Amino acid sequence: MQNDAGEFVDLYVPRKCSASNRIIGAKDHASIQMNVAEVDKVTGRFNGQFKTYAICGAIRRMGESDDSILRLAKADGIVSKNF
Template sequence: SASNRIIGAKDHASIQINISEVDKVTGRVNGQFKTYAICGPIRRMVS
């Protein structure tokens, strides 16, 4: 997670985002991605 916290089962405001990796030479998506999990309290701080 973004805060290094364990995201609990009752945290219904948490999200998980997959960001595609792009080849630096061709500019195309290479089929790999990075996964980011953001817990509800972090989302509330941004809003």
């Protein structure tokens, strides 16, 4: 939200589900934020760098979060587009 002077007027901007493009509400206690370690390419070891995803509670309780986290990890380089 902006006004005609171009300044912003929301209290905060809420996050959206990485699998589904829908807003995660302030009381969605079934939702999660996932965090995953990157590894260096010469020795397969943690360098302290990481990647993150957020998942809606409605997609978790129907059983679709495992396949959603897998598609996200194949779209990024982690699973390397072969299986």
